[PDB]
Design a protein around this ligand. Sequence first.
Ligand code: HEM
Length: 154
Amino acid sequence: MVLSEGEWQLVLHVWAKVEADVAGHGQDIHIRLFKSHPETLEKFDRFKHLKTEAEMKASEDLKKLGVTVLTALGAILKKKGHHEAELKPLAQSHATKHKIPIKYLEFISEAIIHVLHSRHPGNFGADAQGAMNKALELFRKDIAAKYKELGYQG
Ligand code: HEM
């Protein structure tokens, strides 16, 4: 798939707002993911024990991880589809070290969309949401293709 420049503009415009508070957005997104799909929390040996949202908010390690995640995703989005180099190490660790199924990448995409809709309604109307969804679908499609080449595809 290919996004138009107008669609990229909508994506980078709301992302610029997210970048005003990377740590906060990182936390909201992960808490949303863990509360909505608890099975995803099992993949983090480091955080598996967290029982409540209060404990999640209090975790400094979880906050650090959220920043790392959003920083990596932001770097990919800013490439506007030319993200081959950035995708390789990400696909390798998630397929072979962490073993993260494509399904879980769809769950976090839902969490990202939920949080942006909630925090940035004025910059996340229907058109902007469609553009972000398209960007994340492109990301998942390319990651899935890489998973297959790496021998995991799941
Ligand atoms: C927007 C999608 C995602 C991005 C950009 C992302 C990015 C990263 C990055 C950059 C790291 C650190 C270096 C590395 O190991 O590659 C990381 C670690 C990790 N990721 Fe992801 N990730 C994503 C989604 C997921 C999902 C959905 C899961 C699990 C449900 C997951 C589980 C892990 C685990 C277990 C680690 C190691 C955490 C630790 O150090 O304790 N990732 N991820």
